[model samples]
Target: HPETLVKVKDAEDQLGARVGYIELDLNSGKILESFRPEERFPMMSTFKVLLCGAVLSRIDAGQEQLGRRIHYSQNDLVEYSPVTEKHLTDGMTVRELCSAAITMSDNTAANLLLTTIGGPKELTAFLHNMGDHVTRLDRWEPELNEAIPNDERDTTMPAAMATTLRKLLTGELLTLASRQQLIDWMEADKVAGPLLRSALPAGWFIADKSGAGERGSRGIIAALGPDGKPSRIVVIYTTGSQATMDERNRQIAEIGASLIKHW
Candidate 1:
């Protein structure tokens, strides 16, 4: 039935990069739609969601406190993150850091939390414990300043995020309070909503996170659709020669629109 999405097919034809997407039934664990679901792609800033989840998981386990503050010095600053300009001197709380990391895609805040959670080795271990082996966090945001293989950066399978998200949102990985807090932050995400958001109906929202590059974009729209609407999680990851910025925007929009129009 993957072939049923004609617009998606048309979009696929126009894409210059490889695409891997999945629409899954959140509650039932059923895959409603998918294309190249097994391919792994770099997650870019979209990896912040996992970074957020990792810290929050510890909080739920009584290993940390949300109210605990993070001190930032002048050296912690990183460019391109909108939230960094003001907080260069003062630090942030765990809650506040998560808020900026998710809502603003703030690299400095993310680095702070990642270091707080013991860096990529620890985060990757946590994900492994959660049953994912493909998503690896290898470099710091600043480390990405140097050229590296696309696979050398943070990466995930198209289905990996949706599955992990199901656990996190389903109460297996985090407390209800933590889950709600995370969802709330994602709903308020400032930089993550341009593509799929444009295609959703009024009052319908995608509690999603995103990543984009000059070559392509990557993202997951968590879902468990039923009652004949398009409610299942939708993931569209792009990379390589085909996924130009504009190409990704249009292809993703077509997929989103088709999901709404037909489902």
Candidate 2:
């Protein structure tokens, strides 16, 4: 544990950024590595994963249907997302929107989910009911990006976010199929090159969601360790960079590399 702690701190300080990191063993409750593990951090797009869970939990309650088309108008689009850039004038289905929100970090789709699923307060209520005590979407991306920032931004603690992800993976609050589907969507994280998934031996699976914006690069990666044990989860949230975006990502890659190799 001494050596493990040193390496994690070294990696964290190497970035010279305000970062929160944690590697928790769901199987044994061991904190394999961490730095500022309990501190709050801007959640960025990782909040979308929570959004997925909230909507999914609603589905589990038989209050909704995800099979039908979920519509969005011109006014519904956010300026930066692929929803408008790809000229997807046609609406996407609820299932499609869920996947797109995570994979593409589509702000418009995220807002649409918030709007359709009873707004930010309801989503927070859903998460509170399911035991996510810190992660929250207090503003839409558009408002979150506003010049004066009319509303509060999204937020989550490293440990809190990890616990929530662990629950989703273990089917604590979602259906088995729903749990599988969320991870399946997460497994498409082309943007997070091997962070927490880097340098894994064969038979290990890593599913993750990555988010980076003006604030920082934040993401959660859960691994089914070698031989496929769903027991490890790692979260790295970084901001106020002492390094550029590229450097921070590389640092996270190394952080991930360390987790896979040592733990």
Candidate 3:
């Protein structure tokens, strides 16, 4: 794996950015490979996955229902809320909001889901209860994507994000039906075309959420495996460079290529 690390560093040098990554077995919670996996990176839209996990956990506890309708007005719409903006009149279900937030990176939908599970503080509390202390959410959308250098707000490390994903999707943190629904939403994500999904080899199915914002911050968290088995969790993040989003994305895809090759 030294060669893989070498490639990662080379990518950092080429992109003028810091790269962080961690890969693990989805079911066994085993660390497969990593580089700078403990360094912090902004969660961006990737946090929606955890937001939905909290919603599902509440549903499992009989506190929330997916079919419940949530109504919002034009004033509630936030930037980049493609799905939520369109549904302002008719409203949408909790499940639809989760899908919109995860699959479409809909900011307003995510805010609604955030409110449904409580708020930034409660979501942070949920992470704490699930044993993920390093990840935290401090702001709503847009602001959350600020990704200021060296700041910890609304950020997570690769290892922590991967571990939380494993806990929610593969461990006992969520019910089977809830986990499946979340995974399905991830698999349908429209935001990963230029990230890992682009470089990942064929015959391997991928379920991922990707994010991008200020400071060239970009990341992807994926559960992928051969023939759709989804046995591996791969988390990659890049930040602190003025590089273009395309360059940052290519770096992540290259990392994905190396990871797939190594495994």
Candidate 4:
């Protein structure tokens, strides 16, 4: 059943902006509440979460190992990514590259990992194997795409991404041990600017990935309490609003914080 629309509308009003959100209890896959949860939108860097899983699955399949090294070249750079200016071509293991890709949202690191893990075609196939049809991994060019027309970019719905995340967390996508490893990688994510991580409680373990673009941002945050029990999975995606980036981020934080307080 859908959550009371009035409550969702009230929350949107409190935030003073249009919004789409979904909160699910991971243990039972119960959707606590949602508003336009499955609506499609640009996924931003959050797509990296699926990429990360694909890379890991490749390792499990004997195609590659975390210890294998990947070299970064000039063509692999994404202008807006933090790795662009680093010029880090030294021999770095797959594990190291994955760490940088997730923790820092390093475009170079991600690209290098993509090459090491068999690129988009293989990654997309892996995502399908995991039952994620809406989350697509077409390309990794965010900063450079400014010159390209908007219609060319790949996108996915927030709710679909959320469902994929829930499957990963609940040991429904990969084996239990592999799912745990994926969660660990996500919790180590470095892009902590806004969305889910902003409102989480201290000492809580939050494994999440955030996505940003010309219009706005979105993310999936899974909070695990200090005792190591699952807390909640909150997914928020906002776009096409008049608010500035900072203002929109502030709203994301406030919404997440309020949910934590109430739940």
- The estimated TM-scores of all candidates read 0.89, 0.87, 0.96, 0.83
Please, what are the lDDT tens digits per residue for candidate 1 over residues 77-132?
Answer: 78766676577667678898888877777888888898888997888999998888
TM-score (C-alpha) between model 4 and the true structure: 0.83
Residues 155-174, candidate 3, lDDT per residue (tens digit)? 99999999999998887789
Candidate 3, run of 10 with poorest lDDT: 189-198
Model 1 stretches with alpha carbons more than 4 Å out: 1-5, 143-153, 189-192, 224-231, 242-244
Q: Name the TM-score of candidate 1.
A: 0.89
lDDT of 4 by residue, 81-190 (tens): 66434645575777776766767777777777767656766777776777777666667555522212234345566567677777766764566766777777777646
**What are the lDDT figures for the candidates, one per model?**
0.72, 0.71, 0.88, 0.64
- What are the clashing pairs of model 3? none
**C-alpha lDDT (0 to 100) for residue 54 of candidate 1:** 91
Q: How does residue 196 of candidate 4 score in lDDT?
A: 56
Better of 1 and 3 by lDDT: 3
Candidate 3: Cα lDDT at 220: 85
Task: Give the local distance difference test score of model 1.
Answer: 0.72
Go through the candidates in order and give the C-alpha RMSD of each one to the true structure. 2.8, 3.1, 1.3, 3.5
**Candidate 3 global lDDT:** 0.88
